[PDB]
Amino acid sequence: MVHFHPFGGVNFYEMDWSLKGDLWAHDPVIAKEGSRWYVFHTGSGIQIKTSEDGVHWENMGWVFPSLPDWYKQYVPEKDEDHLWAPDICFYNGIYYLYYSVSTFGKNTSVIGLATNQTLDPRDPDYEWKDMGPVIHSTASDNYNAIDPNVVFDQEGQPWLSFGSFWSGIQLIQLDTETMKPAAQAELLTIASRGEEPNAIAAPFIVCRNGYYYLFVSFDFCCRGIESTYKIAVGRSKDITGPYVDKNGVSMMQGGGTILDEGNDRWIGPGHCAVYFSGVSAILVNHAYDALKNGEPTLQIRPLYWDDEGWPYLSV
Numbered sequence: 237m238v239h240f241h242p243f244g245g246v247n248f249y250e251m252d253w254s255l256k257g258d259l260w261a262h263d264p265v266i267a268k269e270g271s272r273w274y275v276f277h278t279g280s281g282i283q284i285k286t287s288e289d290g291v292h293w294e295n296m297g298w299v300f301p302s303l304p305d306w307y308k309q310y311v312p313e314k315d316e317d318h319l320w321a322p323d324i325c326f327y328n329g330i331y332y333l334y335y336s337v338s339t340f341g342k343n344t345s346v347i348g349l350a351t352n353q354t355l356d357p358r359d360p361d362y363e364w365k366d367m368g369p370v371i372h373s374t375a376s377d378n379y380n381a382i383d384p385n386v387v388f389d390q391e392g393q394p395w396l397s398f399g400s401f402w403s404g405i406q407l408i409q410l411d412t413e414t415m416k417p418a419a420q421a422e423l424l425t426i427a428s429r430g431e432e433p434n435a436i437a438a439p440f441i442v443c444r445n446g447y448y449y450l451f452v453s454f455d456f457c458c459r460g461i462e463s464t465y466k467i468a469v470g471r472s473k474d475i476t477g478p479y480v481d482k483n484g485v486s487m488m489q490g491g492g493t494i495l496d497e498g499n500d501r502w503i504g505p506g507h508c509a510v511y512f513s514g515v516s517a518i519l520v521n522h523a524y525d526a527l528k529n530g531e532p533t534l535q536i537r538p539l540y541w542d543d544e545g546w547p548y549l550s551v
């Protein structure tokens with residue numbers, strides 16, 4: 237359905253989603269090129285996994301063997317190589333991979349962009365090119381420049397949403413030829429718990445049947461079995477909002493309908509992505525494995541939509 241997140245002839249609803257293989261993942265996204273599937277997720281130099289069928293996964297290296305020097309202009313206290321929360325989209329033959337450079341609990345952060353002609357390392361044209369910073373935050377800003385997501389609207393215009401804590405979820409128009417915001421582009425805040433510490437993060441926007449759906453993660457990641465992350469959603473007819481949940485509550489005031497808050501087995505599901513193929517759709521996220529000391533684990537499940545258009549997972 238979605239040209240910039242294409243999955244080909246796959247039908248997500250008629251597939252076994254009992255995942256196997258190397259499933260350690262935190263903040264995943266997924267892309268498909270030809271018959272090959274790829275996961276990008278948080279880790280050293282942006283970790284990659286690949287699959288033939290979307291179900292059996294195996295590790296596939298990383299994007300950056302060495303971090304670009306320019307990171308230190310934005311995040312000088314960072315002294316490890318872990319890059320956070322990548323986002324992948326495909327436009328006019330180029331793969332655009334956004335990602336976050338940050339340190340935990342601070343908003344000295346920057347979102348970068350890498351591009352490639354192909355996702356397939358066997359291709360002679362495979363090369364992740366460092367296309368530099370996209371947007372950043374300093375301790376003087378009231379937002380945190382991590383957790384990117386790109387969506388192209390109805391008119392074909394690209395937009396970037398991002399954010400984690402501080403004032404919450406931000407939105408800014410991208411220019412098509414740069415895939416970066418204009419220097420004077422307005423930064424809009426589109427979702428917030430409305431109170432401290434403002435535990436909202438990991439935005440992902442999709443368009444379906446005349447509405448934009450803003451998926452976010454509430455509460456606290458990164459605590460293993462003690463994590464409290466949950467996936468929430470609201471919607472808006474216009475991409476700039478207002479985003480409102482099932483109950484009429486604005487997502488700027490803590491609104492958000494809970495899609496998954498986990499259970500005793502899979503704790504703290506969160507940092508999600510939503511993809512379509514034909515009439516089918518999937519939710520992708522990580523969750524913390526209660527039987528493997530909280531190890532973050534890739535989840536992929538079919539995502540359904542009810543008569544009013546709201547998403548739901550099956551039992």
Ligand SMILES: OC[C@@H]1O[C@@H](OC[C@@H]2O[C@@H](OC[C@@H]3O[C@@H](OC[C@@H]4O[C@@H](OC[C@@H]5O[C@@H](O)[C@H](O)[C@H]5O)[C@H](O)[C@H]4O)[C@H](O)[C@H]3O)[C@H](O)[C@H]2O)[C@H](O)[C@H]1O
Binds near residue numbers: 338402433507
């Ligand atoms: O390898 C596993 C994990 O991957 C990496 O993290 C991935 C990122 O995790 C998510 O963001 C995490 C983190 O949350 C926020 O920090 C914690 C809070 O910061 C402080 O509050 C900040 C503001 O200050 C006040 O103005 C106001 O109260 C607050 O809004 C407070 O101490 C904490 O509550 C921060 O935004 C971010 O660092 C993302 O989804 C993903 O990118 C890690 O390496 C590892 O854990």
Ligand SMILES: [Ca+2]
Binds near residue numbers: 264321323384508
């Ligand atoms: Ca994300």
